[PDB]
Structures are given as C-alpha cells and as structure tokens.
Amino acid sequence: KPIEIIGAPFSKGCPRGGVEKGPAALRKAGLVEKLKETEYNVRDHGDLAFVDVPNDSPFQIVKNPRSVGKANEQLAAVVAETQKNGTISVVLGGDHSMAIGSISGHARVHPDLAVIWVDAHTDINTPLTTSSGNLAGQPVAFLLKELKGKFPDVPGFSWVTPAISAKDIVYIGLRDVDPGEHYIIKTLGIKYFSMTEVDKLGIGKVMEETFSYLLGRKKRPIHLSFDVDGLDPVFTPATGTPVVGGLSYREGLYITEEIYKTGLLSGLDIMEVNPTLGKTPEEVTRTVNTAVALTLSAFGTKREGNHKPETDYL
Amino acid sequence: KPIEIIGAPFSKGCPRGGVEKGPAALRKAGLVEKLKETEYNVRDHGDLAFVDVPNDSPFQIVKNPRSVGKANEQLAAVVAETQKNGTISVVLGGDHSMAIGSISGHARVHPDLAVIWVDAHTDINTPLTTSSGNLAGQPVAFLLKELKGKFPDVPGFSWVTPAISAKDIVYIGLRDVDPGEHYIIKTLGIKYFSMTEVDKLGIGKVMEETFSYLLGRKKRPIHLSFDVDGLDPVFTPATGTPVVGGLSYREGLYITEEIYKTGLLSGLDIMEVNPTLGKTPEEVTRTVNTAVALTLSAFGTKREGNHKPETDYL
Amino acid sequence: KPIEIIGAPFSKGCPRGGVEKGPAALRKAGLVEKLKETEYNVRDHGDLAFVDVPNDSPFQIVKNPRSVGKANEQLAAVVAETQKNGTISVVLGGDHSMAIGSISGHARVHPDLAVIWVDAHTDINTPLTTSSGNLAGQPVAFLLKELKGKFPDVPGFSWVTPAISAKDIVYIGLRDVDPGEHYIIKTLGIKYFSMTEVDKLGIGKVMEETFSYLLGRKKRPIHLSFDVDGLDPVFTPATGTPVVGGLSYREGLYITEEIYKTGLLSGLDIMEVNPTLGKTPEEVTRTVNTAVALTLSAFGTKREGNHKPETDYL
Ligand SMILES: NC(=[NH2+])NCCC[C@H](N)C(=O)O
Ligand SMILES: NC(=[NH2+])NCCC[C@H](N)C(=O)O
Ligand SMILES: NC(=[NH2+])NCCC[C@H](N)C(=O)O
Ligand SMILES: [F-]
Ligand SMILES: [F-]
Ligand SMILES: [F-]
Ligand SMILES: [F-]
Ligand SMILES: [F-]
Ligand SMILES: [F-]
Ligand SMILES: [Mn+2]
Ligand SMILES: [Mn+2]
Ligand SMILES: [Mn+2]
Ligand SMILES: [Mn+2]
Ligand SMILES: [Mn+2]
Ligand SMILES: [Mn+2]
Numbered sequence A, B, C: 001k002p003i004e005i006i007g008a009p010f011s012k013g014c015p016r017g018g019v020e021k022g023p024a025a026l027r028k029a030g031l032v033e034k035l036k037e038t039e040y041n042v043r044d045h046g047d048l049a050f051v052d053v054p055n056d057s058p059f060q061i062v063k064n065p066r067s068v069g070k071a072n073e074q075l076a077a078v079v080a081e082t083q084k085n086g087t088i089s090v091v092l093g094g095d096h097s098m099a100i101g102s103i104s105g106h107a108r109v110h111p112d113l114a115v116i117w118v119d120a121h122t123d124i125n126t127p128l129t130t131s132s133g134n135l136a137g138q139p140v141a142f143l144l145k146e147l148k149g150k151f152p153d154v155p156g157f158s159w160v161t162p163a164i165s166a167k168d169i170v171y172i173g174l175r176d177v178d179p180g181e182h183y184i185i186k187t188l189g190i191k192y193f194s195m196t197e198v199d200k201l202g203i204g205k206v207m208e209e210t211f212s213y214l215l216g217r218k219k220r221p222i223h224l225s226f227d228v229d230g231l232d233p234v235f236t237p238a239t240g241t242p243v244v245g246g247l248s249y250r251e252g253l254y255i256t257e258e259i260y261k262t263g264l265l266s267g268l269d270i271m272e273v274n275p276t277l278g279k280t281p282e283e284v285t286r287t288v289n290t291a292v293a294l295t296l297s298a299f300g301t302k303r304e305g306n307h308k309p310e311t312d313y314l
Helices: A017-029 A033-035 A065-084 A097-108 A141-143 A179-187 A195-214 A249-261 A281-298 B019-028 B031-036 B065-085 B097-107 B139-143 B179-187 B196-214 B251-262 B281-297 C019-028 C031-037 C067-085 C096-109 C138-143 C177-185 C197-214 C249-261 C279-299
Strands: A002-008 A041-047 A088-093 A114-118 A169-172 A222-227 A265-271 B002-008 B043-046 B087-092 B114-118 B171-174 B221-226 B265-271 C002-008 C043-049 C088-093 C114-118 C170-172 C223-227 C265-271
Touching: A002 A017, A002 A033, A002 A065, A002 A097, A017 A033, A017 A041, A017 A088, A017 A265, A017 A281, A017 B031, A033 A041, A033 A281, A065 A088, A065 A097, A065 A265, A097 A222, A097 A265, A114 A195, A114 A249, A169 A195, A195 A249, A195 B196, A195 B251, A195 C197, A222 A249, A249 A281, A249 B281, A265 A281, A265 B171, B002 B019, B002 B031, B002 B065, B002 B097, B019 B031, B019 B043, B019 B087, B019 B265, B019 B281, B031 B043, B031 B251, B031 B281, B031 C096, B065 B265, B065 C114, B097 B139, B097 B265, B097 C138, B114 B196, B114 B251, B171 B196, B171 C223, B196 C019, B196 C197, B196 C249, B221 B251, B265 B281, C002 C019, C002 C031, C002 C067, C002 C096, C002 C177, C019 C031, C019 C043, C019 C088, C019 C265, C019 C279, C031 C043, C031 C279, C043 C197, C043 C249, C067 C088, C067 C096, C067 C265, C088 C170, C096 C138, C114 C197, C170 C197, C197 C249, C223 C249, C249 C279, C265 C279
Parallel strands: A002 A041, A002 A088, A088 A265, A114 A169, A114 A222, A222 A265, B002 B043, B002 B087, B087 B265, B114 B171, B114 B221, B221 B265, C002 C043, C002 C088, C088 C265, C114 C170, C114 C223, C223 C265
Antiparallel strands: none
C-alpha cells in the first residue's frame, strides 16, 4: 500500500504560534526514513505553502477565519487527490483546524469513512459557543452534518460540506470539554470514551467497543485524527493545551496498533506537536519521538517485534 | 443539594507541622469559588479555631491526646450540625485524625453511613500498637465498634462513641500497613482493596465491588474520607507520609466520579495536604490542584464534560 | 525455606561497564538485611570472583566470548550447588548474560523448571543474528533446546547444555525485539506477553495466563529472571538499554507477589541494575530501591501488609 506525507505548517487555529514548526521536527526526527522501513511505500509531498489572507478581520469572535478557511480548502484538495490515487494520506501539521481540510478531502474520495478522534478535547465548539475565536477548537463543528446551519457561515469556509454525521465519529481520551461542547456531544448522541470510560473499561475493551460501533454493520475506511494532547503531558508536553490525566504512552500505541490490524486505515493526522513549548529540549524531543512512534505504529510497527516475510533469519 | 465547607487546620495528629495550612492552600486555590459553579449550593463555615490544651502530656505513647480529642469533639459537633440541616459536609483539614470528629459527627445524624477510606494506610493503629504516638494514624481505631475496649481509654476521647463497625468501611489504595494494623484488619474481616487488588481488578471493577459490598443490601449515606496519600507522590507529593506505587491521578478521579453517581455522597474529607512539604512550589501546587479536582469531581464534575440543564447552546 | 544471595558482578555481556557495581548498590541498599526480616532464612554467598580470560578475541561478532563463557560456567556451578541443598538461589548481577549460568545451574537440579522472563527484550539473538557481539542480548539462545546447532559453537560455552525448550519459557514486558529475535520467537511458538498484551489483558489476567500455560499440566519450579529494564525508565532509569512504555512499578510488584503465592519460586535473577547510568543520584537510588522491592516481594512481602504468625498484636 502507498503512503503520502503531507505537511500542514499552519498555526492560525490557535493564538500560540509554533505548531507550524511541527512538520519539521517530525521529519527532522527521521519520520519519512523510518516509515520507509515499513511494509509501505512512502512518498513525501512536502509542506504545503499557505498564502496568508491580508486584512483577515475576525468573524465575530472567530480569529483568522479566511486564513484558516483558505489553508484548509487547499489541504482538502491535496488530500482528496492522493486519496484519488488510492494512497494513504498522512498529514503532519500544526493546529487541529487542519482536520477540517484533511477529512473534508478524505471524504470526497471516501464518504463512508469513519473517524476516530484521539484528543483531550472534543474541538466541537461552534463559532457561537467559543470562548475564544480559536478555530483549532472547532474542526468537528465544521465537519458535522447535524451541526450545519446551527451556526453562522464563516468567511472562507463556504467550500466546506459536512463530511460525516454524529454516528460516524468516536472520541477517545476526552477530559477537557466545555459546557457547550458537552451539551452538543450529548445532544447529538456522539459516541465517546472519556478518560473515565478508559479507566473503567481499559484501553483494551475501549478499542473493542469503538470498532464494533463504527465497523459493526459495514467495514469502511478509517480516518484517525490524532491530537498528541490526547496523551498525558508527561509523554507529549510540547503542545498548546496540555491537560493532566491523559492517555499513557502505552495506550496511545495500543490505539494505533489496533487500528493498524483492522486493515482499514485510510487517513491519519498527527497534530498539535509544538516544538516551541517544551520547557526543555528533552520535552520537545520526548513529544516528537512518541508522535513518530504513533505514526510508525499506525502503519504496522509492533511492540512485540516485526520481521520481513520470506526471510529465513536462521 | 447544599454543601458546607469546614476547615480543620489541625496538625497535632502528626509530629510534622504544616497540614494546618492545608485549608488555606485549598481555599486559596479557588475551591469555594469553583465549587459554586456546580449544581450545588456552597456555604463556607470558615476554619475552626481549635483551643490548645496546655500541659497536654502524652498518654503513654499517644501524643497530644487531649489536644486532638478536644479538636475532634468540636469538629464532631460542627459536622453533626450541618448534617442536621441535611446539607453535605466537606472537611478540608490537616492530619487525618480529624476523621474521628468528621465521622463521629456525621454518624450522629446518619448512623447507617458507609465509609470509603481512600488512603495509602489503614490508620487503624490502636494506642497500644502504635510505634509512634501519632493519632493521625489511629482514627479508625477510635471509630470502630469492634475495637472498643481493646485499648485503654485516652484523655480527651471519652465523648467518642464507635460510629461504625468492621462491615461498614472499605479501604482503597492500601500499600503501607503495619504488622498490627494488618493483624487487625484481617482479624476483623474488614473489606479492603490494596494496591495489589486494584492492579488485579483495575479501579473499574474495584469501585464496582465496593458499592456492591456497602450498598448491596441497603442504600445508605456515604462518607468518603480521602487521604491525598492514597495517590502516588507524583500526583500529591506535598504530604507527610508519601509512599510509592499509589493510585494514579486518573484512578483518584474515577473513584470520585463514581461515588458522585451513587447520589449517596453525604460527607467528604480531604486530608493530609501539607503545603510545607513540597520540594518545589510546583509540587505544592500540584498537590493542591488534584486535591481540588477530587473535591469538584465528588460533587458532579465530569471528565467527559458538564453542561447546564435547559440551556440550548445552539 | 532457605535463601542464598549470589552476586554476579559481570559486565562483559554489554560494552557498557557498570552493571558489575550492581550487587554492591543492592547490598548497600539493605537487601540482605531487609530480606532477613522475611519468613525466610538468608545466607549471603558473597560476590563471585570472575577470572578474566586474557587475549579474549571476539568470536566473529560475539564479544568477550571466553570471558562470558567462563564466568557463567562458574555461576552454573555455584547455583547448581545451592539448588542441590534445596535452598532458593538469588543472583544479583550485572548484565543478563549471567542468566545462562543461573538457569543452566538451576536446571541441573530442577530440569522441569519453568522460566518467566521479565524483560523489555527477548535477549534471544543467536551469535549469527546479533547486530552487536553483546552476549547480554543472547542468553536465551544459549538456553534453548530448539536453538542448539542453529548457530556455531562459541569458545567457552561448550559446557552449556540447552536447559529448557520453547514451551518452558514465558516473556513478559517485551517491547524492543529485533527482526531476527522476533522471527525466532514466532518460529518456535514461544509464549509471550508484549506490552501490547499487557495493555489488552491487564497484568492481572496476564499473570493468570502465564501460570495456566506453565503450571497447567504439572506444578514445577519457577525461575524468575528479572531484567530491571522490564519496567519503564521512570522506575528503573539506571540501566544499559532503557525503553519507553514499559511495565509500571505496580505491575512489576504484582508480577512478583503472584509468583510468590504459587509457592513455586525456586530461582530468581535481578539483572541490569547499573548504578553508573543514573543521570542523577535520585535515578540510581530509584532503580536500586524498586529492584530491592521486587526481590522482597518475590519472597513474600505484600503491599496489603505482612504480620508474624502466632503474634497477638492486641
Ligand atoms: N486546539 C485545541 N485542541 N484546543 C482545544 C479546544 C477546547 C478549548 N477548551 C476551547 O474552549 O476551545
Ligand atoms: N497520618 C497517617 N496517614 N499516617 C499513616 C499511619 C501508618 C504509619 N505507618 C504508622 O505506623 O502509624
Ligand atoms: N542486555 C540486554 N537486555 N540487551 C537487549 C538485547 C536486544 C538488543 N536490541 C539487541 O539487538 O541485542
Ligand atoms: F488541537
Ligand atoms: F483538542
Ligand atoms: F493521614
Ligand atoms: F493514612
Ligand atoms: F539484559
Ligand atoms: F533484555
Ligand atoms: Mn487537544
Ligand atoms: Mn485537537
Ligand atoms: Mn496516609
Ligand atoms: Mn490517612
Ligand atoms: Mn533488557
Ligand atoms: Mn535482559
């Protein structure tokens, strides 16, 4: 199978700059080279060059609307293209708002795709419920069908068409949800596994249930959108919105090795890796490293070991 | 439902001073304000003023008997009063010896109360089994019916009447028990989940079993006495007797969100938070913060999120 | 029952020196004294004096073959002797290559022994599959029956006779396996619980399965070979090959308390504790301490507490 790396050095989704340097740190860590050592075919599409939209006034509270909107539209295009060539797309980016384009793109080629959202937050704040204008915290609100019309159209996001419905997404790791975000996920009956459920069930059963929920009836493509802050700050400190009591390094990898086994991984996002937020070079390294392991894992790397077929090592 | 904060700045239960500053740190952390944002009605009773008993000679080994005794009698009174007004009592204190008064008080109004003791220690040392005279490690010995008469009456504790029996308490997190304390809990058939059981069952099944044990036949009130040292020093370092291999930040909260769901929380204690023991301001902050989260959790705060009823966020 | 401490200050299995200082650190931590406080009879055999084999040229890639070979032959002898006196042997060593002699020795007296290998690595690299010549990573290749003849005889290891077969060993904690090592463990159908299985099952069920696998039909002696790097660097940082996402302090102890309950512990190894690798005195202390706890645990120490029989503490 084919893999296509696509860097999304974008940070306008969050007021904190830095996440744009994420792709670099990741490539710099040996991601592309390491990936190539897998049973996969790796191609690097390079980092997308996003044109800034001058005098990008804020829509009500929403910040950098047109700039985010345009960057995503370009991402959706790119991804939609690789998806058209049946290759698996990997978006290494900055803030999570790029999930808009990554999925909206993926959807154009695979409308029946399921989404497993690993994050500490729901990121489903509609532009009317946000306490800030940060779009990085609103991706899902833009991807949901059940949310269309519930909030005023935003400048730059007219190209977007709700790609999936409430019954096609599953959150994992939630532990920092707003009153509105919470109201919404409950009101729409969106399946989710907060840290409380993971504690109760254990990541083992957790993954078991998410697969039976999403792949119970039909077997469709999987879009894993991984926000590195789905794990505990002790594993991925270098991020804009760290939250205590998260997923462990182990559960993170367990999540990715399962999705690998389903043979249905179609698209992956590795977001929020900000190298400029590590209190120490060890923390940045630490973040980049596990974020790479998550990617490698998704694509076949196993903790029990891996070996090439037809090779008699004895 | 009503909540009544009651500070117990007492430290005579342990030779280390500092736990008296605990209430401050907690209030100072925004506890009262944050609590008020819950579906509850919060009232702050302020910190109790404990009169020191001069020439408080030690009873055999027991230290500051009369001083502890009197402080508790005053606490039992206070608590017994709020309990009389059907409000939920919250004791923010110093050393755990105040559990004597918090429960003995709670009991006067709710004799059928169950007790979930989250701690790294059993704290059931009778004045005859203690290696030290520290009462902070003897609360339960004073609250048990099966332990009455087994040890010599102590000066200042004549007002106390065993509030509950061996079949009404459940320990969670035990991992540092003395030969005597152990002999006792085994001899009296006191249900408990040491860290070994939590490892085996997983906090999920652990909470499951404690509720079926305590609420199996009848549904009675719950008195959660939480020793912040039920968790690992990595989460609550600022405490007098830290012990490695404890409950995780996650398990602590899982414990409190369940007890919240039972709708039976009647009384809560948040003890052993000592701000003077943090090797660094981060450690003290760290302790105070999770101790607050435990409290907020107990009273409804959910990691999956919370939202107000009748509010259409869309 | 009798316990016999045997120090194996050997480091030629790994290019990094330091693990030879391990026995010291452990004794220096109070191991022997603390052990004596158990229901066991402790005897210290002292640290073995290993004669260096001059001009010990490398066999192909294998480094210090003759030196390792000779040291092990001496260890096998020693252990085989205490085993003959029905006492339980405890090898406190340096690199894991000493597992060769510890088990080969144990085997001579108990050929039906089962082996529970707690380590982050399989250490089953045959001299033909190693990327380095480090024997510390090849112990099992020398102990397996199914591996005999699969690799060229090594200078100094002619005295060795495969002590156990693929169906007599169980790995726990694996998370850093080589292509060849992996090919081998899969090709030989060797039961193992990688960190992925532990995540899935939970150390509780994990221990459950390993006992039914190894003790299902017959009840034989247990040789627990514990490589401190089976746990996460956060617990045992001071080691030559640390790997993230390992066993927790808790799971390590849970592993040992179960093996204790089986009443079948016959032989134990506590390897890879390198005091010269702790970035800070706290890290070295931290490693030594949990390594001691693992040992004490193996021999009866319980987290729920322990008390002497026939002693009425009241
Ligand atoms: N980029 C992110 N993942 N941000 C998290 C979004 C949730 C945040 N608490 C908000 O109110 O918007
Ligand atoms: N205040 C406390 N929680 N202390 C713990 C009590 C147990 C202590 N090891 C003792 O011997 O008394
Ligand atoms: N002494 C050890 N435990 N070393 C681990 C052995 C595995 C190592 N990666 C190798 O290739 O040999
Ligand atoms: F994000
Ligand atoms: F998020
Ligand atoms: F306490
Ligand atoms: F305690
Ligand atoms: F090793
Ligand atoms: F190893
Ligand atoms: Mn997030
Ligand atoms: Mn996110
Ligand atoms: Mn305690
Ligand atoms: Mn206590
Ligand atoms: Mn190892
Ligand atoms: Mn090893």
